[PDB]
Write a protein that binds this ligand. Structure first.
Ligand SMILES: [Cl-]
Length: 130
């Protein structure tokens, strides 16, 4: 229905705003764009489902997220990709891991404070009905 379309449009606007707040934080610059296969030719070979915040925006705009739970699975991938690709004790790896954990924690904290649980429940039930 059009009311359901209105619900998903409000979801899209909410997710666009959370993603923009993450993308303008200087800590998260490395997560804003895909990894350049020049700088890092092994990336695409190690990480099978690359994800970054620009890809998340394109997904929102393609109507790929019908719930905040699905959006958070992609935020979780940005985090787990960096834990897998940068697992060493050296400070460059530790700094990327801490930034990727902080991204994830920040997205979950904004959602805890600003997502109404009944709005998420509605999205989940429309999705499950499709
Ligand atoms: Cl830096």
């Amino acid at each position: 229905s059009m009311q359901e379309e209105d619900t998903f449009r409000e979801l899209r606007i909410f997710l666009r705003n959370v993603t923009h707040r993450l993308a303008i934080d200087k800590r998260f610059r490395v997560f804003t764009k895909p990894v350049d296969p020049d700088e890092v030719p092994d990336y695409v070979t190690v990480i099978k489902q690359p994800m970054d915040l620009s890809s998340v925006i394109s997904k929102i705009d393609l109507h790929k997220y019908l719930t905040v739970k699905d959006y958070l699975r992609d935020i979780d991938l940005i985090c787990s990709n960096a834990l897998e690709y940068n697992p060493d004790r050296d400070p460059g790896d530790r700094l990327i891991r801490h930034r990727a954990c902080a991204l994830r924690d920040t997205a979950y904290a904004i959602i805890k404070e600003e997502l109404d649980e009944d709005f998420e429940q509605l999205c989940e039930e429309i999705q499950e009905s499709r």
